[PDB]
RNA sequence: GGUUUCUCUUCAGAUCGCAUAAAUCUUUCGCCUUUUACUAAAGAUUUCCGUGGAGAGGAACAACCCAAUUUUUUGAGGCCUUGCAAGGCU
């Protein structure tokens, strides 16, 4: 029926030799830092393109004192790359948002 | 090692009551219970076979001379023996 | 025992190894859910490609994210066999060929 | 020949002739005891004694006895459930 | 196995024997066996009058070692 | 007592399947003469290519060693008084 497998050790290690063009080269699982599933899914819902990443269409399509220029000290910008890390933080109003792996 | 030998151990640090070969009876804590039945207490009561008590502060039984020991009831309530 | 043997560099190895290598034993799977490059648009662009192969990139995530987000479990039906219901009559005979030569009557009986 | 007395009820004979009585539970290579709910005994082991069955009883409770100091052993009664 | 008995607590202690016979004898710990025999120094037999007579250092077979107690804090 | 291999029934919780299609309906969008065919997001419901657990029947291949302290190879027996028990004894 050709349902099952198991291999010995020397079998695995010569197929692992010789699949090694086809293979990545990672060890773990940092390098997908803000590349992963759930990145990419808190970026469909708050409308936010990683660089590399995809683009999707928008998930959901006053005078104040809280939004005020004049208290603001901008000192570095937000980046889109902040509010995909700390998605609670840095925006008002996230909806289907995931939160993501921290670090390995 | 015995099955009774590792539930004395047990009761290491609990009050026990212990009678001799001679039927001295000494109630106190259990500081080390030895696999040879060799006991160390403190703070004992120890009460004759004429019936007087006295008081003792530290004691080590060898195991050989002890005819029995009480422990704590709570204690025994093993199961898988 | 010795310390270490010609196998022990390569089963140390195999720990840090990608799947399936990772393990000693599996299900076989179909071929064609095997895609084999699914790995490298997981990765980010090479640097200095051109813009076709850089946006080539971003669609290829954009339909592995679609896939992911919309997943629901397979629901439990009842199968039909569509196979077996004809090899049960006597309409339909069974038999072993070349791959080539079914291919050619597949062509003609479509003709 | 042990092992199937476990958990009843165990009237015990001591070398200086006392009368332990308690759930037999354990036992080892030394006949080392362990006598759940055990009392002591010294004046009769009771067979309807019409006078009384019972002088000088003592509640022991979880008794370990020593095999040098035990003599022999016979059924007193069934397990109890608990 | 060949356990040594938990004694180095008591070392250099005075104590007190009991002993079979109703023996009791009190003197300082100083050393022992597997078999729990004892060196006892500046011993002291407690005679069953309640007179009591200097013996010196002497070896108690731990045999015939019924109990001890400590006559110092350990 | 086993293994392999076909057919059927039943239950599917598990990444049911380290993979991934289509259709129908409702919302919003993009196309803009009308309808096919469509653009792309959300939700609901089906179909299809595959899978797992259990049960029944058929066929094929293998087989009926511890007596010298701490326990179990003994400090073991004998005398006196009172109401077997306690104590003193040898």
Same mark, same amino acid.
């Given at each position: +029926?050709?349902?099952?497998?198991?291999?010995?050790?020397?079998?695995?290690?010569?197929?692992?030799?010789? #699949?090694?063009?086809?293979? +990545?080269?990672?060890?773990?699982?940092? *390098?997908? *830092?803000?590349?992963?599933?759930? #990145?990419?899914?808190?970026?469909?819902?708050?409308?936010? #393109?990683?660089?590399?990443?995809?683009?999707?269409?928008?998930?959901?399509?006053?005078?104040?004192?809280?939004?005020?220029?004049?208290?603001?000290?901008?000192?570095?910008?937000?980046? +889109?790359? *902040?509010?995909?890390?700390?998605?609670?933080?840095?925006?008002?109003?996230?909806?289907?948002?995931?939160?993501?792996?921290?670090?390995? | 090692?015995?099955?009774?030998?590792?539930?004395?151990?047990?009761?290491?640090?609990?009050?026990?009551? %212990?009678?001799?070969?001679?039927?001295?009876? @000494?109630?106190?804590?259990?500081?080390?219970?030895?696999?040879?039945?060799? %006991? $160390?207490?403190?703070?004992?009561?120890?009460? @004759?076979?004429?019936?007087?008590?006295? $008081?003792?502060? $530290?004691? @080590?039984?060898?195991?050989?001379?002890?005819?029995?020991?009480?422990?704590?009831?709570?204690?025994?309530?093993?199961?898988?023996? | 025992?010795?310390?270490?043997?010609?196998?022990?560099?390569?089963?140390?190895?195999?720990?840090?190894?990608?799947?399936?290598?990772?393990?000693?034993?599996?299900?076989?799977?179909?071929?064609?859910?095997?895609?084999?490059?699914?790995?490298?648009?997981?990765?980010?662009?090479?640097?200095?490609?051109?813009?076709?192969?850089?946006?080539?990139?971003?669609?290829?995530?954009? &339909? &592995?994210?679609?896939?992911?987000?919309?997943?629901?479990?397979?629901?439990?039906?009842?199968?039909?066999?569509?196979?077996?219901?004809?090899?049960?009559?006597?309409?339909?005979?069974?038999?072993?060929?070349?791959?080539?030569?079914?291919?050619?009557?597949?062509?003609?009986?479509?003709? | 020949?042990?092992?199937?007395?476990?958990?009843?009820?165990?009237?015990?004979?001591?070398?200086?002739?006392?009368?332990?009585?308690?759930?037999? !539970?354990?036992?080892? !290579?030394?006949?080392?005891?362990?006598?759940?709910?055990?009392?002591?005994?010294?004046?009769?082991?009771? !067979?309807? =004694?019409?006078?009384?069955?019972?002088?000088?009883?003592?509640?022991?409770?979880?008794?370990?006895?020593?095999?040098?100091?035990?003599? =022999?052993?016979?059924?007193?009664?069934?397990?109890?459930?608990? | 196995?060949?356990?040594?008995?938990?004694?180095?607590?008591?070392?250099?202690?005075?104590?007190?024997?009991?002993?079979?016979?109703?023996?009791?004898?009190?003197?300082?710990?100083?050393?022992?066996?597997?078999?729990?025999?004892?060196?006892?120094?500046?011993?002291?037999?407690?005679?069953?009058?309640?007179?009591?007579?200097?013996?010196?250092?002497?070896?108690?077979?731990?045999?015939?070692?019924?109990?001890?107690?400590?006559?110092?804090?350990?």
């Amino acid at each position: +029926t050709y349902q099952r497998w198991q291999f010995t050790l020397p079998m695995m290690s010569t197929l692992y030799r010789l #699949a090694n063009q086809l293979l +990545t080269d990672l060890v773990d699982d940092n *390098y997908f *830092y803000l590349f992963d599933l759930k #990145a990419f899914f808190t970026s469909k819902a708050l409308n936010m #393109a990683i660089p590399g990443g995809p683009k999707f269409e928008p998930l959901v399509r006053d005078w104040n004192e809280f939004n005020d220029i004049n208290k603001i000290i901008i000192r570095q910008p937000i980046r +889109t790359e *902040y509010k995909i890390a700390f998605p609670y933080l840095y925006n008002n109003l996230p909806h289907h948002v995931h939160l993501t792996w921290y670090h390995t | 090692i015995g099955v009774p030998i590792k539930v004395l151990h047990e009761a290491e640090g609990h009050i026990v009551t %212990c009678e001799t070969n001679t039927g001295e009876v @000494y109630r106190g804590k259990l500081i080390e219970a030895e696999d040879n039945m060799n %006991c $160390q207490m403190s703070n004992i009561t120890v009460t @004759y076979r004429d019936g007087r008590v006295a $008081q003792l502060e $530290q004691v @080590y039984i060898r195991g050989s001379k002890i005819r029995f020991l009480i422990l704590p009831d709570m204690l025994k309530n093993m199961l898988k023996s | 025992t010795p310390l270490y043997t010609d196998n022990t560099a390569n089963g140390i190895a195999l720990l840090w190894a990608p799947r399936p290598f990772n393990l000693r034993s599996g299900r076989t799977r179909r071929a064609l859910d095997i895609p084999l490059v699914k790995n490298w648009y997981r990765e980010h662009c090479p640097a200095g490609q051109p813009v076709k192969v850089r946006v080539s990139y971003q669609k290829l995530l954009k &339909y &592995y994210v679609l896939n992911a987000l919309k997943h629901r479990p397979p629901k439990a039906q009842k199968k039909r066999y569509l196979f077996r219901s004809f090899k049960a009559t006597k309409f339909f005979q069974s038999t072993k060929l070349d791959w080539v030569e079914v291919g050619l009557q597949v062509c003609r009986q479509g003709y | 020949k042990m092992l199937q007395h476990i958990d009843y009820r165990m009237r015990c004979i001591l070398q200086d002739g006392r009368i332990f009585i308690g759930t037999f !539970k354990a036992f080892d !290579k030394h006949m080392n005891l362990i006598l759940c709910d055990c009392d002591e005994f010294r004046k009769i082991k009771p !067979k309807n =004694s019409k006078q009384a069955e019972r002088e000088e009883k003592r509640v022991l409770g979880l008794v370990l006895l020593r095999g040098e100091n035990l003599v =022999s052993m016979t059924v007193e009664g069934p397990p109890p459930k608990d | 196995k060949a356990h040594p008995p938990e004694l180095k607590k008591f070392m250099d202690k005075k104590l007190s024997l009991k002993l079979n016979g109703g023996r009791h004898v009190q003197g300082i710990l100083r050393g022992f066996d597997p078999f729990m025999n004892l060196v006892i120094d500046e011993c002291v037999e407690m005679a069953t009058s309640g007179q009591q007579n200097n013996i010196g250092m002497v070896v108690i077979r731990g045999n015939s070692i019924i109990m001890l107690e400590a006559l110092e804090r350990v």
